[PDB]
Amino acid sequence: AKDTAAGHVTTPCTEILFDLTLAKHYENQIQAAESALNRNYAAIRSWTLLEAMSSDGNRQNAYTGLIAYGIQITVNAEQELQGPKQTKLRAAAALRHRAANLSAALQIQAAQQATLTKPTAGGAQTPFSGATGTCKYEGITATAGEQSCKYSTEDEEKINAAHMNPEVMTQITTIGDKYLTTITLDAIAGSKGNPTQSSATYAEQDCQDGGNPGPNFGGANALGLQVTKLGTKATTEKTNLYTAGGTECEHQPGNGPQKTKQRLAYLVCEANKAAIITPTDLQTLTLDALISAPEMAAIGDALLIQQLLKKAYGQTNEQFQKNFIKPLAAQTVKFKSNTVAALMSSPNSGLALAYHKGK
Amino acid sequence: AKDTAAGHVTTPCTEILFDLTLAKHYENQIQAAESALNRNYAAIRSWTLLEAMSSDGNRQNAYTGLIAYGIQITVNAEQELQGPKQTKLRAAAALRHRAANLSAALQIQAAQQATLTKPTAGGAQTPFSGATGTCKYEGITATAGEQSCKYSTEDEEKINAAHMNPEVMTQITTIGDKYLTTITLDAIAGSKGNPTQSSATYAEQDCQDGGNPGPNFGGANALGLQVTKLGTKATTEKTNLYTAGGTECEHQPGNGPQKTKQRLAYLVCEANKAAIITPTDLQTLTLDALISAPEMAAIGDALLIQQLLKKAYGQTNEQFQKNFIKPLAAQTVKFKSNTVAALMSSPNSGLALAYHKGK
Ligand SMILES: *[C@@H]1O[C@H](CO)[C@@H](O[C@@H]2O[C@H](CO)[C@@H](O[C@@H]3O[C@H](CO[C@H]4O[C@H](CO)[C@@H](O)[C@H](O[C@H]5O[C@H](CO)[C@@H](O)[C@H](O)[C@@H]5O)[C@@H]4O)[C@@H](O)[C@H](O[C@H]4O[C@H](CO)[C@@H](O)[C@H](O)[C@@H]4O)[C@@H]3O)[C@H](O)[C@H]2NC(C)=O)[C@H](O)[C@H]1NC(C)=O
Ligand SMILES: *[C@@H]1O[C@H](CO)[C@@H](O[C@@H]2O[C@H](CO)[C@@H](O[C@@H]3O[C@H](CO[C@H]4O[C@H](CO)[C@@H](O)[C@H](O[C@H]5O[C@H](CO)[C@@H](O)[C@H](O)[C@@H]5O)[C@@H]4O)[C@@H](O)[C@H](O[C@H]4O[C@H](CO)[C@@H](O)[C@H](O)[C@@H]4O)[C@@H]3O)[C@H](O)[C@H]2NC(C)=O)[C@H](O)[C@H]1NC(C)=O
């Protein structure tokens, strides 16, 4: 089923939730990838220490092969991350920017009741040069209390990173531009008798004189207006991410002016297409992943093919784990105390290496 | 002179420029620090290759000392960056969020001319139960063309990262909240004759009947209103970053409700106080910086004090540069071609290390 999340956007608040949720999804993809690289670099420092601490030549070559393998794949994956990272961050910033815009518009569009000021009565005056009575109001205002978006359990279940994988997203839903640009209001004028510049009794926030001025045009002559409501209705719009053929982004820029929804759909499409490749996690490497890794052929040939690799790293995963993986979190190093991996990510990392390479 | 940049904020557009400029300043501080770390890690990979390519034991120890020194300071500086990074990013996100808000409010507050709709005439009706004539308008709107902020040369010279060092910043200036929450308008009603529900000639966007209805209340009886302008005036406000004593952030959260300006001032204060420590640039290391570096005492003692260091790295900077710095960009490595530093940041980094450690 496609477009579960976008198909749940029906209001300004759910567009805000979609936009923020998708931005956080892209941000989290980058953070996860960068965490995988940092873990790999921490593994490389750990093996560097173990390589300096081993006396056996072939075991030293074994660690060196893990160092070389790790450097190759992690440097490559870090370089490869840069394009997708920038593409995804471009979309996340724009989505956050849109959600801010919409939240600000929502607060203003909630200002739906006017407070009248005290008017001033006149005769003919611009823009009613032909009137015999005018009632002029300055500084009518409308303000709402602080608005907040409330989400139900299902809003948060449907508009969710779990439904934002690229394979299920074909469109975005946005609030129409009028909500962000247009003030709307209703107003009504009322007249009774012969209102003039002498209609200067203002106690009812209108212009009255004659008889007994009072509530509900109590007086003989009365003129007034009210702004009886404000607020522009939100509408929704759909925008496709892809061309009709399905591969290419719709709404590429540079082809003429675009609306906000079109610019957002383009950025979302590109961010969806910019898949991240995460390299192997070195800290949980298995024997089979190592010897079947394509980079290990030339590395093992340089240092020692798959028969040679097993000869270096173990015939089973159990002994590979014991010799090359478990020491990272379990082997203690003390000199003048910490486990290998934490030590080589600590303030004493360099000093532990110098101490053991010199000893 | 303090507060050059904030003292130049006098309008919504210059607050937007300040907020975006400061966010980019914090972002650039993080990027610069991370670039310095990446350069250092690239130096460490380069020395790792040279250490594998050297035949002399003491020259191998020399490279190892540079590796150990680089790992220590760069891992430490990377760990130390994390708190300040998050503090600065918190402020940059909030400043961008505010600038978005303000730009959206600016577009709405620019909608200063109303378009009247065709009214409907009535007699007495809510909210004028006492009127004999009413003229009711639904869906009056106000919309502006697309707004943009224009900056002068001096706006960009004063509101500039060059004036945003922590030592010169004591306050921020923000637009008052009413600009973001309140619609303001002027309106006027006009009456002539005896307008009633029969005043149903609407050609002038008012209610007329009798005689010859026409422009300027041409008819005998007329009722109408106009919204003659809209728009809320921007005002500015100052908020101090520090308490009266000058050390501590003012506007710490958790002490009661806060306004937007207070939350922003707190984040800006904390981001200003969260100074980043950048480590030595390994790729341009001098001899004197190396031997005077505090970490090199224990490292050199472990591998080889300052007399020992000169013995290992050179008596002059010229020979230190030749032996340990210049080979990074100048020494070519070829096997089955690239300079050392680029090779060890390339897809063949790991393989170059394996090849030379095995040879
Ligand atoms: C969040 O909400 C904010 C607030 O509304 C949005 O911010 C607005 O974003 C739009 C789109 O990015 C901005 O419009 C752009 O404005 C720039 C600059 O325009 C000014 O400077 C130009 C020279 O630098 C000048 O040519 C312009 O003057 C022309 O245009 C005006 C208006 O049409 C016209 O009156 C003039 O006579 C000129 O003809 C102007 O002075 C402009 O460069 C951009 O142009 C590109 O895009 C449009 C639309 O695709 C296209 O027509 C062009 O051909 C060109 O390709 C564009 O107009 C706007 O200024 C922002 N408003 C504010 C207050 O900041 C923001 O987009 C929202 N974000 C999200 C993610 O939702
Ligand atoms: C950009 O512009 C946007 C749009 O205006 C700004 O977004 C607004 O930000 C403010 C401040 O962060 C948001 O207000 C917060 O709202 C949350 C959630 O409130 C709702 O949920 C609560 C439970 O989760 C509930 O208690 C709330 O109900 C109470 O409050 C309302 C309103 O006062 C009242 O009517 C109720 O009866 C209850 O008494 C509500 O349903 C809330 O948790 C926050 O409270 C903290 O902060 C306030 C002020 O410091 C303080 O009073 C509290 O004691 C508490 O410490 C806060 O109210 C607001 O919802 C956002 N609006 C929208 C549309 O998103 C944004 O801040 C701008 N950014 C920048 C950087 O300029």
GROMACS .gro file of N, CA, C and O and ligand atoms in nm, chain A residues 15 93-102 180-181 254 256-264 267, chain B residues 13 16 99-108 145-151, ligand 1:
model
  244
   15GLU      N    1  -0.009   1.807   0.814
   15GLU     CA    2   0.103   1.837   0.724
   15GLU      C    3   0.227   1.872   0.804
   15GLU      O    4   0.338   1.823   0.775
   93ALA      N    5   1.597   2.030   0.566
   93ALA     CA    6   1.588   2.171   0.601
   93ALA      C    7   1.462   2.234   0.541
   93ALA      O    8   1.397   2.319   0.603
   94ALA      N    9   1.433   2.202   0.415
   94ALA     CA   10   1.317   2.262   0.352
   94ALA      C   11   1.189   2.216   0.418
   94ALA      O   12   1.094   2.295   0.434
   95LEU      N   13   1.182   2.088   0.457
   95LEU     CA   14   1.061   2.040   0.524
   95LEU      C   15   1.042   2.107   0.660
   95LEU      O   16   0.928   2.136   0.700
   96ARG      N   17   1.151   2.124   0.735
   96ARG     CA   18   1.140   2.196   0.862
   96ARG      C   19   1.098   2.341   0.842
   96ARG      O   20   1.020   2.395   0.922
   97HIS      N   21   1.150   2.402   0.736
   97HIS     CA   22   1.120   2.539   0.702
   97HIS      C   23   0.972   2.552   0.669
   97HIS      O   24   0.906   2.645   0.715
   98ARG      N   25   0.920   2.458   0.589
   98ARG     CA   26   0.778   2.457   0.560
   98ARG      C   27   0.693   2.436   0.685
   98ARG      O   28   0.589   2.500   0.702
   99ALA      N   29   0.732   2.341   0.770
   99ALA     CA   30   0.651   2.318   0.890
   99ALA      C   31   0.648   2.444   0.977
   99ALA      O   32   0.544   2.476   1.036
  100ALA      N   33   0.761   2.516   0.986
  100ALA     CA   34   0.761   2.641   1.063
  100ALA      C   35   0.662   2.740   1.001
  100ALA      O   36   0.576   2.795   1.070
  101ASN      N   37   0.672   2.759   0.869
  101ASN     CA   38   0.583   2.849   0.798
  101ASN      C   39   0.437   2.819   0.830
  101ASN      O   40   0.358   2.910   0.861
  102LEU      N   41   0.402   2.692   0.818
  102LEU     CA   42   0.263   2.650   0.834
  102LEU      C   43   0.216   2.671   0.977
  102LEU      O   44   0.100   2.710   1.001
  180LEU      N   45  -0.143   3.053   0.371
  180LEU     CA   46  -0.024   3.125   0.410
  180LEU      C   47  -0.022   3.270   0.363
  180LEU      O   48   0.068   3.344   0.405
  181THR      N   49  -0.112   3.313   0.275
  181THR     CA   50  -0.099   3.448   0.218
  181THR      C   51  -0.221   3.536   0.236
  181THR      O   52  -0.209   3.657   0.214
  254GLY      N   53   1.458   2.511  -1.259
  254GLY     CA   54   1.524   2.563  -1.377
  254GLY      C   55   1.435   2.562  -1.500
  254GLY      O   56   1.481   2.600  -1.607
  256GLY      N   57   1.117   2.717  -1.504
  256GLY     CA   58   1.014   2.818  -1.492
  256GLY      C   59   0.975   2.829  -1.346
  256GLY      O   60   1.015   2.749  -1.264
  257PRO      N   61   0.894   2.928  -1.312
  257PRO     CA   62   0.858   2.948  -1.169
  257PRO      C   63   0.788   2.825  -1.112
  257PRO      O   64   0.715   2.755  -1.184
  258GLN      N   65   0.806   2.800  -0.982
  258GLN     CA   66   0.743   2.686  -0.918
  258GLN      C   67   0.671   2.728  -0.792
  258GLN      O   68   0.710   2.825  -0.728
  259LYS      N   69   0.573   2.650  -0.754
  259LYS     CA   70   0.509   2.670  -0.625
  259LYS      C   71   0.584   2.593  -0.517
  259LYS      O   72   0.662   2.501  -0.545
  260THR      N   73   0.558   2.631  -0.392
  260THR     CA   74   0.625   2.569  -0.278
  260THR      C   75   0.611   2.417  -0.282
  260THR      O   76   0.708   2.344  -0.255
  261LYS      N   77   0.489   2.369  -0.308
  261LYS     CA   78   0.464   2.225  -0.312
  261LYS      C   79   0.552   2.155  -0.418
  261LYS      O   80   0.590   2.039  -0.400
  262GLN      N   81   0.580   2.222  -0.527
  262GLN     CA   82   0.658   2.161  -0.635
  262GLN      C   83   0.805   2.156  -0.595
  262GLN      O   84   0.873   2.053  -0.618
  263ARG      N   85   0.854   2.264  -0.534
  263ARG     CA   86   0.992   2.262  -0.485
  263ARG      C   87   1.010   2.155  -0.377
  263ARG      O   88   1.112   2.086  -0.375
  264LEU      N   89   0.911   2.139  -0.288
  264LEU     CA   90   0.924   2.039  -0.183
  264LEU      C   91   0.919   1.900  -0.243
  264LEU      O   92   0.994   1.812  -0.201
  267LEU      N   93   1.259   1.807  -0.386
  267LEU     CA   94   1.362   1.778  -0.287
  267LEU      C   95   1.337   1.643  -0.220
  267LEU      O   96   1.432   1.566  -0.193
  372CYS      N   97   1.276   4.220   0.837
  372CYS     CA   98   1.378   4.168   0.744
  372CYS      C   99   1.518   4.168   0.807
  372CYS      O  100   1.595   4.075   0.781
  375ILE      N  101   1.529   3.875   1.053
  375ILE     CA  102   1.554   3.754   0.973
  375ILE      C  103   1.701   3.742   0.933
  375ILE      O  104   1.764   3.636   0.950
  458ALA      N  105   1.339   3.260   1.210
  458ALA     CA  106   1.342   3.337   1.085
  458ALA      C  107   1.231   3.290   0.992
  458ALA      O  108   1.169   3.372   0.922
  459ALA      N  109   1.204   3.159   0.987
  459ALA     CA  110   1.094   3.109   0.904
  459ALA      C  111   0.962   3.170   0.952
  459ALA      O  112   0.886   3.227   0.873
  460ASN      N  113   0.936   3.161   1.083
  460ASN     CA  114   0.815   3.217   1.141
  460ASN      C  115   0.795   3.361   1.099
  460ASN      O  116   0.685   3.401   1.056
  461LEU      N  117   0.900   3.440   1.115
  461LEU     CA  118   0.891   3.584   1.090
  461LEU      C  119   0.867   3.612   0.942
  461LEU      O  120   0.793   3.704   0.907
  462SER      N  121   0.932   3.535   0.855
  462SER     CA  122   0.910   3.555   0.712
  462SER      C  123   0.766   3.525   0.674
  462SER      O  124   0.709   3.592   0.587
  463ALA      N  125   0.707   3.423   0.737
  463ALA     CA  126   0.569   3.386   0.709
  463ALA      C  127   0.475   3.493   0.761
  463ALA      O  128   0.377   3.533   0.694
  464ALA      N  129   0.504   3.545   0.879
  464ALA     CA  130   0.421   3.652   0.932
  464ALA      C  131   0.433   3.776   0.845
  464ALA      O  132   0.334   3.849   0.826
  465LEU      N  133   0.554   3.805   0.798
  465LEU     CA  134   0.574   3.922   0.712
  465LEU      C  135   0.487   3.915   0.587
  465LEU      O  136   0.431   4.017   0.542
  466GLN      N  137   0.479   3.797   0.524
  466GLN     CA  138   0.395   3.784   0.405
  466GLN      C  139   0.248   3.815   0.436
  466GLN      O  140   0.180   3.886   0.360
  467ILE      N  141   0.197   3.766   0.548
  467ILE     CA  142   0.058   3.793   0.587
  467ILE      C  143   0.040   3.940   0.628
  467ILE      O  144  -0.061   4.004   0.590
  504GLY      N  145   0.115   4.048  -0.300
  504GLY     CA  146   0.212   3.979  -0.384
  504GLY      C  147   0.325   3.921  -0.301
  504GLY      O  148   0.343   3.954  -0.182
  505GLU      N  149   0.405   3.837  -0.365
  505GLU     CA  150   0.518   3.775  -0.294
  505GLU      C  151   0.614   3.880  -0.237
  505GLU      O  152   0.665   3.965  -0.311
  506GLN      N  153   0.639   3.875  -0.105
  506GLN     CA  154   0.730   3.970  -0.040
  506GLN      C  155   0.871   3.913  -0.045
  506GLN      O  156   0.890   3.791  -0.046
  507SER      N  157   0.971   4.001  -0.043
  507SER     CA  158   1.110   3.959  -0.029
  507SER      C  159   1.185   4.061   0.053
  507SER      O  160   1.152   4.178   0.050
  508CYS      N  161   1.288   4.017   0.123
  508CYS     CA  162   1.366   4.110   0.204
  508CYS      C  163   1.481   4.162   0.120
  508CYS      O  164   1.551   4.082   0.059
  509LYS      N  165   1.498   4.294   0.116
  509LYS     CA  166   1.610   4.355   0.043
  509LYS      C  167   1.709   4.411   0.144
  509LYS      O  168   1.669   4.486   0.233
  510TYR      N  169   1.837   4.378   0.128
  510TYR     CA  170   1.940   4.424   0.220
  510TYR      C  171   2.036   4.519   0.149
  510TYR      O  172   2.074   4.497   0.033
  719LIG     C1  173   0.847   2.975   0.402
  719LIG     O1  174   0.776   3.096   0.393
  719LIG     C2  175   0.857   3.202   0.340
  719LIG     C3  176   0.779   3.331   0.355
  719LIG     O2  177   0.669   3.347   0.264
  719LIG     C4  178   0.894   3.171   0.194
  719LIG     O3  179   0.988   3.273   0.159
  719LIG     C5  180   0.964   3.317   0.029
  719LIG     O4  181   1.026   3.225  -0.060
  719LIG     C6  182   1.013   3.267  -0.198
  719LIG     C7  183   1.059   3.152  -0.285
  719LIG     O5  184   1.192   3.115  -0.253
  719LIG     C8  185   1.097   3.393  -0.218
  719LIG     O6  186   1.080   3.437  -0.353
  719LIG     C9  187   1.202   3.442  -0.423
  719LIG     O7  188   1.249   3.576  -0.415
  719LIG    C10  189   1.380   3.588  -0.475
  719LIG    C11  190   1.429   3.735  -0.452
  719LIG     O8  191   1.333   3.818  -0.517
  719LIG    C12  192   1.369   3.958  -0.505
  719LIG     O9  193   1.503   3.977  -0.552
  719LIG    C13  194   1.517   3.946  -0.698
  719LIG    C14  195   1.657   3.965  -0.739
  719LIG    O10  196   1.731   3.899  -0.644
  719LIG    C15  197   1.420   4.030  -0.781
  719LIG    O11  198   1.433   3.988  -0.919
  719LIG    C16  199   1.277   4.008  -0.734
  719LIG    O12  200   1.193   4.094  -0.806
  719LIG    C17  201   1.120   4.024  -0.908
  719LIG    O13  202   1.013   3.950  -0.851
  719LIG    C18  203   0.912   4.028  -0.778
  719LIG    C19  204   0.807   3.932  -0.719
  719LIG    O14  205   0.768   3.838  -0.819
  719LIG    C20  206   0.852   4.133  -0.871
  719LIG    O15  207   0.760   4.212  -0.796
  719LIG    C21  208   0.971   4.219  -0.931
  719LIG    O16  209   0.930   4.331  -1.006
  719LIG    C22  210   1.070   4.131  -1.008
  719LIG    O17  211   1.003   4.073  -1.125
  719LIG    C23  212   1.265   4.037  -0.584
  719LIG    O18  213   1.276   4.182  -0.567
  719LIG    C24  214   1.362   3.556  -0.628
  719LIG    O19  215   1.492   3.548  -0.679
  719LIG    C25  216   1.300   3.417  -0.649
  719LIG    O20  217   1.277   3.402  -0.793
  719LIG    C26  218   1.279   3.267  -0.845
  719LIG    O21  219   1.164   3.196  -0.812
  719LIG    C27  220   1.037   3.243  -0.862
  719LIG    C28  221   0.936   3.132  -0.822
  719LIG    O22  222   0.995   2.990  -0.857
  719LIG    C29  223   1.044   3.267  -1.017
  719LIG    O23  224   0.935   3.347  -1.060
  719LIG    C30  225   1.169   3.339  -1.060
  719LIG    O24  226   1.169   3.340  -1.201
  719LIG    C31  227   1.297   3.276  -1.001
  719LIG    O25  228   1.321   3.148  -1.067
  719LIG    C32  229   1.172   3.400  -0.568
  719LIG    O26  230   1.079   3.493  -0.621
  719LIG    C33  231   1.034   3.499  -0.129
  719LIG    O27  232   1.104   3.623  -0.137
  719LIG    C34  233   1.031   3.453   0.017
  719LIG     N1  234   0.962   3.552   0.099
  719LIG    C35  235   1.020   3.604   0.208
  719LIG    C36  236   0.939   3.704   0.285
  719LIG    O28  237   1.127   3.567   0.246
  719LIG    C37  238   0.960   3.034   0.185
  719LIG    O29  239   0.974   2.991   0.050
  719LIG    C38  240   0.881   2.925   0.260
  719LIG     N2  241   0.957   2.802   0.264
  719LIG    C39  242   0.906   2.679   0.249
  719LIG    C40  243   1.007   2.567   0.240
  719LIG    O30  244   0.783   2.658   0.246
   0.00000   0.00000   0.00000
